[PDB]
């Protein structure tokens, strides 16, 4: 079928992650929400992506806001998008947040929901779901050891999401984000695995 192909399979939207900024809550009292952006983060999504070794990503992002109530309130949220190079905002008010370079979108809660399309971010021709081996040359201690996996290439960057208010919010906001991959070309033989637990869904 249609379904079989990657695009069809992939094309369904997914919830990459949700971030909470409680109005009242001490946490996210500070303006902060930023998220690093992983294609991963979805347990289910992770496995599927894992299935193929490498892919190139083009994606649509959809933004929706909902409270735990599920009721929506009026906030004007502007969230900008940082590359990995950058220093991030330190605080809500933080200066950088008024930044020239991070993609700025201004939306209200409804929104009706903001949508964007976002490019693949990697110095390399692909994102690797797994790496075996260090990004680092130097001696390889037991301490350093955690380091094998990382494959920094698969590091999308951050979304920083800023609220307007200097003061604390009256009302609480949480964000859920959905990604569609606009189109993926993926090809490589690679097993999906079911096995015992090194960790969640982990080969290794």
């Amino acid at each position: 079928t249609e379904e079989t192909s990657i695009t069809n399979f992939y094309s369904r939207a997914g919830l990459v992650g949700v971030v909470n900024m409680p109005v009242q809550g001490t946490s996210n009292t500070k303006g902060f929400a930023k998220w690093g952006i992983d294609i991963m983060g979805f347990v289910q999504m992770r496995r599927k992506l894992e299935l193929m070794t490498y892919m190139r990503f083009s994606a649509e992002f959809t933004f929706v806001a909902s409270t735990p109530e599920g009721e929506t309130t009026n906030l004007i949220l502007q969230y900008m998008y940082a590359p990995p190079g950058a220093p991030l905002p330190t605080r809500r008010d933080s200066y950088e947040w008024q930044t020239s370079t991070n993609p700025s979108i201004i939306s209200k809660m409804a929104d009706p929901p903001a949508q964007v399309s976002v490019p693949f971010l990697s110095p390399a021709s692909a994102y690797q779901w797994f790496y075996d081996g260090y990004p680092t040359f130097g001696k390889h201690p037991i301490d350093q050891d955690f380091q094998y996996g990382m494959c920094p290439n698969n590091m999308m960057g951050t979304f920083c999401v800023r609220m307007i208010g200097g003061g604390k919010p009256t009302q609480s906001v949480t964000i859920r984000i959905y990604m569609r991959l606009k189109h993926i070309r993926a090809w490589v033989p690679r097993p999906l695995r079911s096995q015992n637990y090194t960790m969640r869904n982990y080969p290794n």
Binding site: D132, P141, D145, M199, P203
Partner: protein, 254 residues
Amino acid sequence: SPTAEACGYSDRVAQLTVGNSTITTQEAANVIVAYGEWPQYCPDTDATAVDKPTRPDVSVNRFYTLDTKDWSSSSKGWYWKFPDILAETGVFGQNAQFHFLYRSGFCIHVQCNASKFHQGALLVAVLPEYVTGTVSGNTGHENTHPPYAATQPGATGFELTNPYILDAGIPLSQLLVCPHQWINLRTNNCATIVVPYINSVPFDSALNHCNFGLVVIPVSPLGFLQGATPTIPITITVAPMNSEFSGLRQAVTQ
């Protein structure tokens, strides 16, 4: 279609040629080429480096009989990190250690002293990423992690304790998904694979994490009488295709 019986392949022959070496084995495997590709030399468009690479073809590309391991009735397989193993030996290895970037496919020949009797086919596979993982304390809490020595087995191609442990977490059953040339050894026990590969990472130093790991893990137990010989060695010889390296610099084993 392929002959049903043999894991084989090859009664007929195989010949591998490389600079300053040719090897022919009657008991050989027909070559299976990875993903229907054949190893190539990096294109100009492909290459960032802007340094003229050195392609010592012959000395570098040729036959190394890195190791022999005897096989018991059953044995835990070991798998062989591509970059390091050659690296230990010259000429290739010396250059490899010397030079920052190594990328190339290679042709692999695995041969055993021919024995008809041998059974219990052994799986041979190459895996690009092969990313090792631990029991993590077996609670799973532990979150544990690599040896450097493990990372660079060197020539030896340090063994994996458990077949799924082989990399990573991949069950013997499922592993087949990555294609294997099995040696049933029911026929002559030999395998030939050429793995041209397009690497996931556009460049890997391979000074560090190895580009490939070549794995050998027996599917089926060798079974045999008291009647005949307890032992047969398995030896692996491989010759790389013309590699590309950049970064001349000083020499580091790293």
